[PDB]
Amino acid sequence: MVLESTMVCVDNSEYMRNGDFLPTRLQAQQDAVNIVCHSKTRSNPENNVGLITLANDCEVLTTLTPDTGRILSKLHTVQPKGKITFCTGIRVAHLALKHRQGKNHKMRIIAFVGSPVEDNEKDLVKLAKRLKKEKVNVDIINFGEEEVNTEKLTAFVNTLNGKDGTGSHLVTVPPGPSLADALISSPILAG
Amino acid sequence: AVDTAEQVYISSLALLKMLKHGRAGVPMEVMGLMLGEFVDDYTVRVIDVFAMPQSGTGVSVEAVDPVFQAKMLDMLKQTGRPEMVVGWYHSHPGFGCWLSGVDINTQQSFEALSERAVAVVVDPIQSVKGKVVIDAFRLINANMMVLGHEPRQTTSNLGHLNKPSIQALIHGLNRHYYSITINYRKNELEQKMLLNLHKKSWMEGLTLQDYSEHCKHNESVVKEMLELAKNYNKAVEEEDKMTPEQLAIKNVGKQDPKRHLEEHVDVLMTSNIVQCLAAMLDTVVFK
């Protein structure tokens, strides 16, 4: 079918730890990842979904595999404790997608941020023009709590779909602990 | 047609993979694949070899498990570089090299896809230094045997250089398969970095070798060297006698002085000259 490789970047930072969302923040984002990796598998059997983090230690928790049983086994007692480090989060997200079996796939990443970021906006726009010369489209979806009216992420997606990119979006977080299934119902319906 | 100058270029890495897999599981006939880079009508090049696991107890070539190779063919494909299977091998343990009737059938299943898959036999037992026992083969059609026609249409004086063994000539050579002359692809990227790394003595000759016992060993030889010279004070005395060609047959029971007596002199020299010199370089260098 259409050639992509869906790569989710899960959020094991230390601000996603409370119990304001109804089951858990961890389980509600997990089953959201489950129904969208069921969305990317059943529309195209070639796509595999592994998970990466953007914490202090950007670990390959589960390897990029079409199995999800390792994903389901590690996300139980996953210990989401760590200072968020998004300035290395692009480089772990981009260089992973060059380690793939096919470079003819559409480079697509989703990114979950539920913690206050301490990046430089000048450093990301150097990474944004780095991604301009690398032709990468990433739809970042905001979870949890953050600086409201998300700071430095509007200017990054704007400098992501620049130079005739014009296809990316920025799904921001509503600061109310509602059920997050309908929150992500917009990327599963259209891009 | 073929010009009997087929000249199989192989490798430097595969031969070590061939002998290690052929020696560790020796008395059962083991096998594997040949993952090389195919070239023109004349030659063929096999650079990589991966080994295939067995099936059960018993000397056989049993069958290939295409579950294993299909996952293996795309294993290193995603990591290194693409290659293509150009042949296969097995290992006669202590025989030599031929195609048995069991060996020929699994060959004939492999020549169906490509007409140039090479059957390779290695023998990791009759090999010592300058012998690596080899001579890969390939089938000939038995259809041409009924015609009485001699194949392979010799256009160069390059094929009939090696002479086949008579034990392989008992088998299907030359009625079902043929030999192929091979050489080896060596290069300085590998040649120097295995020569200068194998036997390098570190600081051994800058020692004194057990200084009370070296002069003790300098009598452990000399004492029986006296009586071995008494034999040399004996065997020369029964000459001008029965025609010393007779002194060649007759001296196979008991020991002779003359060879044994020039033996220890080499031992009592290199043990002394090396140890006396190394003592006198330590005095200068160490203060």
Partner: protein
């Protein structure tokens, strides 16, 4: 199941009988020396796992 048991004989017919011998002494780690229950005395090796 009538093809199951008859498939066991399809590959059971490839095992080879083994000469029954007797160990006389041991020269080195690999040099063994035996005599069969037939006749002559041999010098023999082993597997590396046995």
């Amino acid at each position: 199941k009538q093809y199951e048991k008859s498939e066991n004989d399809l590959k059971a017919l490839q095992s080879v009988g083994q000469i029954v011998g007797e160990v006389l002494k041991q020269l080195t780690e690999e040099k063994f020396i035996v005599k069969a229950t037939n006749g002559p005395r041999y010098v023999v090796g082993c597997r590396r796992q046995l």
